């Protein structure tokens, strides 16, 4: 069985393509073309979180919608207070090549990593008064691109070794390793129930994983190039992707195919960040042309543009209550938009 | 209008700002270098002369603190992390002169020097290094001397006139590596020939980064 397995592979791919074609009875803008396209919202800046001295590469909100962490290529990791623009902590990183950061749901730990191939977890609520690193997770052979806290004691990391992984923080070990990607994995998103997570990779494909069994459940194609950002719809039944081809897309798990493509002729710069709203109506997508296009999910209308930043927007995030949006760019500035 | 705990939070924030700007001022005074090469080249010799991801190297020479970001352990795609080095003072690129006739084993029969040339073309014309100078090291020149006689350069460069002198084939290699620069008047490439020794490569990088610093200061002042 040298090429018989390969031939079975193409026949199965064709069968999956036919099954996916069978599901699409009509396009999205044929059953959603009856509701009003609410938008035309500009969300002027309310806070400007200055203090960084290099490109901001990743930010993450807290579950209180009050504290947010930001990572920049200067060996700094700042917990802000978006309400009063205060700084709670300033962690000096051992490796300055940070391009992912996380905030634990309990608010006790902050994750960090990048081109050091190590995910570093910091304790914010020590009795000594200083923020110290708890454990340095090291099992990856490529750059870490995203880390999201499963719980207080579990993390999920995506690396540029065509591999995502799940760790036990206390033991600092590979609880389960998620393999199956062809190119580098660039983004993660954990479902609200914390049982599945999507991972978009440089192979122009995104897959759905089961955290417990440790195997892929669904695979998604459609993009022409690298997938940079990914995020879940609030229900956890859909997820949005963003590629370095100036195109966003929305996949739904049950249908197991794309539904809507967010693109325009005047946008040729790709995407670096994608986030959803509280109701998931707003697809806030940070594009490479120094602005964050506030898309509408149910339609493809570019509802708004957040044109504050004078350099490429690398990270944006929405509060748990949807009150604020915090975009971060290569200009060392964070802006809170409301 | 705000409470005493808010006042003390503001004071703590101001202290954090002062520490942050002090750290930034310290960082902006320290020169950054990116090392690239074909692995078989003298990257290891260069790093060992100065003293599973980025092996970042620190050394101090004539009151300039140096950082050398030795990537190369990354088997991933350079396109997805090369922009993080946008802003290095200079790029150190090492190519082995003893590669034109050394085993054509890049993928399976590809000449090593051709691989180094396409790597140099990729780095030089990259859009993140439009104004980033390149310090090209043409290493293993001794093996070049005792291998020109055994084998001609026509195997790698058939267009060569056949002049198999030491200081004509090396000059030809240097010329072919310069010619890949598609945008002059915005970038200078500093090639280097002293010896297989110390005390000169470090000084060469020091001179190149001093020239880059002067150019950066002129551009900051607006004259150039």
């Amino acid at each position, epitope marked *: 069985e040298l090429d018989q397995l390969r031939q079975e592979a193409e026949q199965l791919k064709n069968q999956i393509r036919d099954a996916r074609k069978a599901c699409a009875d009509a396009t999205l803008s044929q059953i959603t073309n009856n509701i009003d396209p609410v938008g035309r919202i500009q969300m002027r800046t309310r806070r400007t979180l200055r203090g960084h001295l290099a490109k901001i590469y990743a930010m993450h909100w807290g579950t209180d919608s009050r504290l947010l962490v930001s990572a920049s290529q200067d060996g700094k990791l700042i917990i802000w207070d978006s309400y009063t623009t205060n700084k709670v902590h300033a962690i000096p990183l051992r490796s300055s090549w940070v391009m992912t950061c996380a905030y634990a749901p309990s608010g006790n730990y902050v994750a960090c990593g990048g081109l050091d191939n190590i995910c570093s977890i910091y304790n914010l609520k020590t009795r000594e008064g200083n923020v110290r690193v708890s454990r340095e997770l090291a099992g990856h052979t490529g750059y870490l691109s995203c880390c999201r806290f499963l719980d207080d004691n579990q993390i999920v990391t995506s690396s540029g070794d065509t591999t995502c992984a799940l760790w036990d923080i206390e033991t600092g070990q590979q609880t389960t390793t998620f393999t199956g990607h062809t190119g580098d994995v660039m983004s993660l998103s954990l479902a609200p129930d914390t049982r599945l997570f999507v991972s978009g990779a440089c192979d122009a494909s995104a897959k759905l994983w089961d955290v417990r069994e440790g195997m892929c459940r669904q695979t998604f194609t459609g993009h022409e190039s690298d997938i940079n950002a990914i995020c879940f719809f609030p229900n956890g039944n859909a997820f949005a992707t963003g590629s370095d081809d100036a195109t966003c897309r929305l996949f739904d798990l049950r249908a197991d195919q794309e539904l809507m493509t967010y693109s325009h002729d005047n946008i040729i710069c790709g995407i670096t960040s994608v986030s959803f709203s509280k109701s998931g109506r707003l697809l806030l997508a940070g594009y490479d042309d120094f602005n964050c296009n506030v898309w509408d999910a149910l339609k493809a209308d570019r509802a708004g543009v957040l044109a504050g930043h004078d350099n490429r927007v690398s990270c944006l995030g929405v509060t748990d209550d949807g009150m604020a949006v915090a975009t971060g760019s290569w200009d060392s500035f964070l802006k809170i938009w409301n | 209008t705000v409470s005493a705990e808010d006042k003390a*939070a503001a004071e703590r924030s101001k202290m954090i700002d002062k520490n942050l700007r002090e750290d930034g001022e310290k960082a902006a005074r320290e020169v950054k270098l990116l090392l690239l090469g074909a692995g078989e080249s003298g990257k290891n010799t260069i790093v060992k002369q100065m003293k599973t991801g980025i092996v970042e190297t620190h050394f101090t020479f004539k009151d300039l603190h140096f950082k050398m970001f030795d990537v190369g352990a990354q088997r991933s795609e350079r396109k997805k992390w090369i922009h993080c080095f946008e802003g290095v003072t200079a790029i150190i690129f090492c190519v082995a002169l003893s590669a034109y006739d050394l085993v054509l084993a890049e993928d399976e029969e590809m000449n090593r020097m051709h691989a180094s040339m396409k790597l140099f073309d990729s780095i030089c014309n990259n859009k993140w290094f439009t104004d980033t100078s390149i310090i090209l090291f043409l290493n293993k020149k001794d093996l070049f001397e005792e291998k020109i006689t055994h084998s001609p350069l026509t195997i790698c460069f058939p267009e060569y006139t056949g002049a198999n002198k030491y200081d004509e084939a090396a000059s030809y290699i240097q010329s072919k590596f310069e010619d890949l620069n598609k945008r002059k008047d915005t970038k200078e490439i500093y090639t280097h020939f002293t010896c297989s020794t110390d005390t000169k490569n470090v000084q060469f990088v020091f001179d190149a980064v001093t020239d880059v610093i002067i150019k950066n200061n002129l551009k900051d002042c607006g004259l150039f």
Partner: single-chain antibody
Framework: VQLVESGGGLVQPGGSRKLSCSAS????????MHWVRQAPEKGLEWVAY????????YYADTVKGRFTISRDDPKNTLFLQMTSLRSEDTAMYYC??????????????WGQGTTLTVSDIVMTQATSSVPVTPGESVSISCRSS???????????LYWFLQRPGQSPQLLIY???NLASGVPDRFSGSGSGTAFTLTISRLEAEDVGVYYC?????????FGAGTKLEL
């Protein structure tokens, strides 16, 4: 974490002494420091305050012009130089650390104590003592003069317990927020002016004197002190 403090003793009237507090366990360089004294029979009263990166120093009106507070972070020591010691300065002085970042727990750790023998929102704890029995729910009430609530949602009232031969320890930093090593059988509930503490079950360590301290601005007046007895 420990804050051991030395100095103090038989000082002649109209004299001067310096109290020294040494910090070892924690990062003293990033914490504010409060000095809180307590007369041998009377309750607690705030006597000084210094902040991290000393720019804000606050004194009580009782000892404002003749006391001073000094800290030297490299040796992690807190100092208090007092001058013209009037007789009303006989008290047991405590060192308490604090930090004021968002969601911090100020007045969390207290010191051992130093004896001294020399020869504003009003906090009222009307009930001086209560006969309490094992395994019953008890509640302590504290009354204020000005509203302790602030426009930012906070309510600056602090609850402490002073065991018979022990230093005070924080139970409730805000009006409703517990502390690190405190059992979850303590609870706090207040209003604009009225404030109450609740204990679900009395234990063998809960006997002591309970105090309430305001932190609206900086007078930091403590209350009279409710003393549970079994």
């Amino acid at each position: 974490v420990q804050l051991v403090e030395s100095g103090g003793g038989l000082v002649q009237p109209g004299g001067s002494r310096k109290l020294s507090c040494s910090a070892s366990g924690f990062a003293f360089s990033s914490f504010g420091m409060h000095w809180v004294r307590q007369a041998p029979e009377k309750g607690l009263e705030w006597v000084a305050y210094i902040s991290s990166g000393s720019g804000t120093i606050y004194y009580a009106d009782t000892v404002k012009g003749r006391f001073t507070i000094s800290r030297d972070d490299p040796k992690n020591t807190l100092f208090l130089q007092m001058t013209s010691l009037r007789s009303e300065d006989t008290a047991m002085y405590y060192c308490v650390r604090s930090i004021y970042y968002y969601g911090s727990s100020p007045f969390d750790f207290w010191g051992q104590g130093t004896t001294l023998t020399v020869s504003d929102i009003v906090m009222t704890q009307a009930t001086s003592s209560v006969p309490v029995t094992p395994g019953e729910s008890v509640s302590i009430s504290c009354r204020s003069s000005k509203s302790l609530l602030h426009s930012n949602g906070n309510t600056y009232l602090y609850w402490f317990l002073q065991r018979p031969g022990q230093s005070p320890q924080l139970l409730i930093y805000r009006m409703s927020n517990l502390a690190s090593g405190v059992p979850d059988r303590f609870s706090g509930s207040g209003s604009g002016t009225a404030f109450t503490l609740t204990i679900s079950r009395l234990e063998a360590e809960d006997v002591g004197v309970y105090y309430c301290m305001q932190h609206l601005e900086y007078p930091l007046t403590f209350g009279a002190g409710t003393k549970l007895e079994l």
